[PDB]
Amino acid sequence: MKISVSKNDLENALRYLQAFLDDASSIASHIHLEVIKEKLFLKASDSDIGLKSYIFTQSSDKEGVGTINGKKFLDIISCLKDSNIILETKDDSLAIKQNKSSFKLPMFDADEFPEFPVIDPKVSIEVNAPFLVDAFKKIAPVIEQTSHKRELAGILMQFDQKHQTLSVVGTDTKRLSYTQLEKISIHSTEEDISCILPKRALLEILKLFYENFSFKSDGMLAVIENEMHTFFTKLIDGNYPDYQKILPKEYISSFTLGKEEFKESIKLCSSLSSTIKLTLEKNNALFESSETAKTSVEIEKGLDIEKAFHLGVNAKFFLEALNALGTTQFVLRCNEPSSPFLIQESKISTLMMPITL
């Protein structure tokens, strides 16, 4: 601020910013306020990630800067009425006013709020289709934030300028989920270039972005930008493993199976245990957890098998793999019961390690 009037546009801006805050003694716990013309600009950052956002002002009597504790600011705004709220700096205090209610909060020197990074892009793309963010959404569940292998704690973005391809890859060592987007105009200095986005960053991207944004990276940070927001995250330093070297080249069998039938059957048995025995027969699939859950689905289009094929699976992994698919039916390819098996549509594939017995 300097003296602005503004709506509960504010509340919304402040909700999204909470995730980017850090310890109330720290500047990182504060949201940086800045009025330029008819816009209040809001920034929050804790080193790893950052967000810039803005709202329009109902009046701008004076331009200026400020800071305020980000959590406390939201708490106060969420208590006020759906009318205009006056924001005003008085010395080192931020004044929030509405009718007969007036609040004061202490500010840090806004020059000591850290600046958002300006990077020199090594790679840069414009995203107009939802496919990238659809792939993030679907691959996110397979990635764990706290991985023994530091590099696996995010999602991989593998740019190949030469072929116009952006490969998106997630793993936790028990499943590997991947997709490759065609026809991306990749403006990059090197031909090949990999960014690993942390999981925390990935989950924030999902809340803020879908279509019509820029993605730039310099190998250290990655900046995503649209008309409302500039977002930054640090990348995971490290080399993501070569996923293509682990994908089996050949599968002995490939079974076309009904997605929602399998989903429902796996939910059923998952009420008694997290691991499921799946038995594929020619015209039937059976699912089994002193206790027992069992259920079966018919397969009209008989499978190519003489002897029945047993397979131990984690219920939740199999479900998450099927949620990645948009087709009504899916393909399960496997070699031996103990060997990895693949799940895919009639863009996202999931390679999965089975369980024994």
Partner: peptide, 6 residues
């Protein structure tokens, strides 16, 4: 008890 893929 699960096998390790990587």
């Amino acid at each position: 008890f699960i096998r390790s893929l990587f």
